[PDB]
Every structure is written in structure tokens, then in C-alpha cells.
Design an enzyme around this catalytic site. Sequence first.
Site, PDB file in Angstrom:
ATOM      1  N   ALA B 168     -59.035  11.149  54.343  1.00  0.00           N
ATOM      2  CA  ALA B 168     -60.195  11.334  55.212  1.00  0.00           C
ATOM      3  C   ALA B 168     -61.408  11.717  54.358  1.00  0.00           C
ATOM      4  O   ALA B 168     -61.870  12.857  54.336  1.00  0.00           O
ATOM      5  CB  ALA B 168     -59.898  12.386  56.270  1.00  0.00           C
ATOM      6  N   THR B 170     -64.496  10.909  54.734  1.00  0.00           N
ATOM      7  CA  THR B 170     -65.617  11.396  55.536  1.00  0.00           C
ATOM      8  C   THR B 170     -65.503  12.893  55.810  1.00  0.00           C
ATOM      9  O   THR B 170     -66.491  13.627  55.691  1.00  0.00           O
ATOM     10  CB  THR B 170     -65.716  10.621  56.853  1.00  0.00           C
ATOM     11  N   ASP B 171     -64.307  13.365  56.174  1.00  0.00           N
ATOM     12  CA  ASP B 171     -64.115  14.795  56.412  1.00  0.00           C
ATOM     13  C   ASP B 171     -64.351  15.595  55.140  1.00  0.00           C
ATOM     14  O   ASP B 171     -65.058  16.610  55.149  1.00  0.00           O
ATOM     15  CB  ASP B 171     -62.705  15.063  56.944  1.00  0.00           C
ATOM     16  N   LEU B 172     -63.765  15.143  54.031  1.00  0.00           N
ATOM     17  CA  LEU B 172     -63.882  15.860  52.768  1.00  0.00           C
ATOM     18  C   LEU B 172     -65.322  15.859  52.270  1.00  0.00           C
ATOM     19  O   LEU B 172     -65.792  16.857  51.710  1.00  0.00           O
ATOM     20  CB  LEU B 172     -62.939  15.237  51.742  1.00  0.00           C
ATOM     21  N   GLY B 175     -67.045  18.467  54.183  1.00  0.00           N
ATOM     22  CA  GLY B 175     -66.650  19.767  53.664  1.00  0.00           C
ATOM     23  C   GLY B 175     -67.339  20.106  52.355  1.00  0.00           C
ATOM     24  O   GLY B 175     -67.741  21.250  52.135  1.00  0.00           O
TER      25      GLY B 175
END
Lengths: 405, 404
Positions: B168, B170-172, B175
Site C-alpha cells: 500500500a 499510497t498509505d505509506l 504516512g
Amino acid sequence: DMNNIKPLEGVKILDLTRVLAGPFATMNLGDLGAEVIKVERPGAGDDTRTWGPPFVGTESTYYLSVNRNKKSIAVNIKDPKGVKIIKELAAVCDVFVENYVPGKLSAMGLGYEDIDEIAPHIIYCSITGYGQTGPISQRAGYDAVASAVSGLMHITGPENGDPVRPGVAMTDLATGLYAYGAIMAGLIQKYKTGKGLFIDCNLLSSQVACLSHIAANYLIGQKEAKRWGTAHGSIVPYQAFKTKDGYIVVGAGNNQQFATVCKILDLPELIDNSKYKTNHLRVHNRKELIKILSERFEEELTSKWLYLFEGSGVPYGPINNMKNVFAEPQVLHNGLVMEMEHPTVGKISVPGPAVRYSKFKMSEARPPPLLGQHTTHILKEVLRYDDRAIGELLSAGVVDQHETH
Amino acid sequence: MNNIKPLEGVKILDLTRVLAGPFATMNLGDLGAEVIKVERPGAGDDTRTWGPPFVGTESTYYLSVNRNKKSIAVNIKDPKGVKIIKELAAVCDVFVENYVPGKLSAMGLGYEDIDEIAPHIIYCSITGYGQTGPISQRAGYDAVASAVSGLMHITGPENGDPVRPGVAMTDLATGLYAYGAIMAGLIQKYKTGKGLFIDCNLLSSQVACLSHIAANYLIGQKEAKRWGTAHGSIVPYQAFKTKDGYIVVGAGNNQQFATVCKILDLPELIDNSKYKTNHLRVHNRKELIKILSERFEEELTSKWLYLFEGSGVPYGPINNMKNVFAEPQVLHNGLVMEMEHPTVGKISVPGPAVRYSKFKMSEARPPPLLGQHTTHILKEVLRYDDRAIGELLSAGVVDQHETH
């Protein structure tokens, strides 16, 4: 007077980076209010300048995207007189950023040991392919090569199909984000100790760290990962579905969500079916369930599905191309389209800052500098060079100044 | 001076779940910050139940991104739980949450409420699409966000269905944005003496990452397409199938192209009119790739790595999980990080990407058990006596693990 002030305001950054990984990090620092000095080769400049088409005026769209909020000075680092200019800038610069192969700047006298002598305070950040030291450290850093070595390429692609790479250089961008945070950590460390430090950022470490749970599956459980296309290994159904006019991503993470999706698709029998009663059962019967769902999604247009799924409360979205992305009102409302006035190119639009803060706004941004645009200004003001010496440097070819100032 | 971490003495109140938020606070935990993780009693973080793989009672997903944290189980829905979070916020420098916009405001944990009691606090909110907007109420999911942001459209085989990245990203990326942004807030707080609010979302992070590709459409009105492992403007620069696997080889100029041709024992291609220049190679991409691909299939991947050693051109092998951590460079960078979990034993997760000269992040606290530090945090941070702690425990407002 401190009500509306940017955090990195008053921080000078000496930027010698090229391509994408380095410039993306310094760009985001520039948005935060830091003064970024970009050092480029006379005549050629950053590699991205020549990476066209698309070309607008004399500036490539690649270069403009990631080089806003910067000032350009053209210095020949290979010439000894150029090395002196870089050292003098380092004395007054808080941060030093470079993305050359380890030992290249050190061979030219611009290594961390050399810079530390004149600027012990300086925060030195090095972005590389594989790290400062190691067996493969001398290899140059490339996004596609790194994603292959780091294992991201192995797990990205269609199931039982050839590996593929992410459309954008996410390994490069992730490393830039690592460095952009790391440089700020150095400043916080610098305030307490009063001394600078050296930072190591590399594509390999960034991508491997991002593997996270997938890598932990092998490290702890000795489980080897595989390509899943748009689907997820442990959650069914959670993938992109082909429709009459496009693709839609629909997911259900629990029986409540699965019942909601089935009702919207007018397939209530699936809810009480023994094969699909639970998520684990759905994962076990993944092949059969996806086939039934895919047949339903193809029957209707993407626009109808978006209308039907409105307010569903389950994961759902459309695959958007570049035209569709910036058509979305949410993208525009978030400020993602940033327009700036280029001195010779006119109004231009690039993707805006991802982060928004309450105290200050970053919407107003300086346009990307022309090659050697601020060469004379930086020399005359920052380094207190008289006009005579600047002319001698210009004639010799040590420095380059653009027509537009 | 060793053992001196930049964020040491900074308390972070962490209410995040799943991946984007915990990845941000984990990297802040490595930098020396004290991270207090607030979880639901009984259930905890969503990732805890995301198994198999399960080691003991802890999922590998949870363990990967939750090292260097302390866990306190508090029921925020209960009014007594809200008071505990407010009391913690008064003594905590940073507040991080990843709930849907407006959810915490309904429960009394919104930024306005926290700002009154903790004006110094740095409040960071991670959402799917942002705090406000037409689709802001939708929850944030990596696969959904990459589809909407346009990353999925440009990722996949040429003339093939779109695919998503294995992890993921996009998530990382979001973050990583927050982890840098939170530090920007701390620097601003030092100057001003007051906190601020931060907005981080998956959509904004991924769109900003589109960068030059998005700039092509915004400025040049050019629509992007999927290229597989190949590149639109540079030929040859793609993954090539080998006898036992795949190798990525690229040539960015005529000198590099000659180097590749010699290694492949195809010197006639160098002087061929069809492939004399990069632009010519791009025009005859189909013919050139076919010839090169036939040569690469004949030999093993290891043989190519031997032949390409010291070539100076882009070249690398596609590695599976076993091959990645087999690589000595990965080990040398410290990427394999081992910690001693109290009930799970010795475990290994991906290490920190960044290494600093002044301090070391190699030794890390293991991921906390659910409610492991509930009694400790209440007793020490908030100076709660044993009598008050028992009353909260009996009611179920707070949960304490058997292991402390």
C-alpha cells in the site's frame, strides 16, 4: 508577528540534487518556507531539463513539476574555483543535500568530511541507490532497478502474469519523503546539540522498509509473496471490476459490508450462501465468487454503479485517468492543482502540496527557476562577490547566468 | 555523543489504526519520541485481527508497523474514556488520529476540544480524502485511493488491465508525509509556543506524487498510458525474462546501448540504422525488444549478473522475498531488525530506512500487547492511584493485559 509564519522560514538549504528523488525532497522543504539554493551544471543543468517532450517554451514539464520554490545558481563543481563557491555557500547554509554516487563528491573535495570542516553545523543528507557503503553501493541509483532488487516489482502485477512497475517512481518519491523528514530531524537534533550530522538515505532501504507486513510475512512466517493484480490475498472481494465503460474498485471487509455489496448488486442469495458466509470462506471460494460478481458489474455502466454505491459505506471508487483525476471536485478543493506565474513561460499548473496546515498557507509558490537565473544575485548578495570577479567567473565558464534574472 | 535521539522527550498520543497512521508514528518512535497507542478494549487495532500469518496471539501485520510504542486500551465512546484522553492530551506534545472527519468531534475529541485543554498540542489528522469536500466523508482505503488518484490507471501491463502496487504505497506515502509534517509542526511550535492542525490524506499524497506525469496533462495536455515495466521515452529500459527469472536492464544513451549490446554479443545492432539513436530505438521499440528478449531468455539470471558486473549501466534482478533478504546489501543496511517480544519471542521486521551518524536506531522496543501499558501509563503519566485504576478496570472503561 508570529501568527502566520512558515516553520522552515529562515533555513537555507544547499541543493545539489538531480532527477527526481532529491528534487522532490527539497521541493517539499521549499514549500515549508526554507530557502533552497539549487546548484546546476552550466549549459546542461539538471538532467530533467532535457527530458522532453513535453516541452513548454524551453522548460520541460518534468523539470517544472518538482523544482518549484527554488533558486538556481549554475556553478562548475569540477573547476577548482567552483568548489570554493560551494564551500562558501555551505558556511552560511544549514542543510546540504546531494544525490551523487558515494565518494564522487568526496573525490571532488565536496565530501562530508570537507564540508564538516567549514560548516560543522551543516546537516548533510546523501541520497543514493543502495547506501553509503556495501558491496553494491557503487552502483548508481535507478527507480526501476531498485524496485526490482527491493522486491516490490516481484509482488506488483497481474496474478500469474509478468511483473510490472508502478506508473510513477514511488521508490524515488518515498526516498525523497524519507529524506525530507530526516532533514527536519537533523534540524531538531542541531538545535539541542549545536552540531550538524550526516544523513544516509537510499532507495533500497526506503523500498524494503515499505514492504513492512509483506516482508514480515517472510521474516517471521517464512511465507513467500505473490502477485495479486488488483485483488488482495486475505480479503475477498477487494479488487477492481471491469464494467461496460471502465473499471470500478469495490471491497467488502466484513459480512455487513458484503451483505451491502450483494444487495446493491441485486445478489442477495450470495449473503446466505454457505460458500460465501464468511470472509475466510469467501477467500477459499475466491475464484467462483469473483466470477459471479464480475458478470454483474459488466452489465452496468461505471456511472450507474457510482450512483448506486453512493452512501453504501463500503470501499468503492473508480479508476481515473489524468483527465478524470483533475475533473474530480475533491482534487480541486484540496488545492491539488497549483498554478504559478513563470517569468518566460507564463501561467503553468503542477500538482500542489499534499499537506495543509492551519497556521500557514503554502498555496502561493515561487515558479521553478531558469538555469543560472539567480547566479549573479546569489554571488553578489550571499557571497558578497563584486561585479568584477563575477564577470571573470562568467568569462572563464566557472559560473553561468541566464538572460532573465 | 551517542544514545542522543532528536525526538527524545516528545510524547505522542497515537489513536491511529491500520497502516497509514501507525507507519508514521513508528518512524517517529524510532527517532526517540514516546508514542502512546490508544486502542479499543477487547478488539484493539484493526490489524491485530488481520491474520494469518499469526505468531502467538499477534498478527505479523500488526507487528510490522507497531514497534517502539506503548499500548493503552481506553473506551473513547464512554465519557470516562474521553476524560482520560483529554488528560493525556494536556501532557502530550503531539496528537495523531486517522478517523473519518468529524467522528472525534462528535465524541468530544475533536481539534477544537483538544486545543482548549492543550493549546501547545500538534494535532495531525490522516483521512482518505481530506477534512472537507464532497467525498470527504468516505473512508480511506489504499486500493480505492490509488484508483481515484490515477495511480492504478498508469500501473499495469501495456494493453492490459490495470494493477495495483503489491504494498500500500499510497498509505505509506501519506504516512511519510505526516511523519515529516508532524516534525514541521514541532519546529513551528518551538518558535511560536502554540500548536497547529495538520491535514494529511491519501488522495492528496498520491496526486502530488503523480508529479511529472500529472504535469504532462496539466501543461502539455497529454494523457498517460500503462507501460508494463518499460518506459515511454527510453528504450531499452525494462524487465527482461531470463532462463530462470527476470532481469531489469536499461540504456540511457548510445554509449550505454553499445555496452549492453557487447555484453549480449549483439554488436551488429549498435551500428544498425534502426537503433542508432535513442529516438530511433523508441521508434523501432517492438523490433528491438524482440531481438534483445530472445538473447536474454537463453541464459540464466546469475550469468547475466556476472556479465553485467562493472558495466556501469542500469541493471538489476527482480527479487522475491527470499532473494531480497538473501542480498548482503540489505543485511548491511540493517534492514533486518530483530527485537525480543515478551510472549512471542525473537522476531524480525523491516528496519529503519534512514541511518544517522550521531545516533543509532538499531535497538527498538518490541510492539506492545493490547493494553500492556494501561496501568503503567495511568499510574505514571496521570499519577492515578491504585484505587482509581481498579474502578476503571471493573467498569470496563480501560483494559490491562496480563503481561505488563
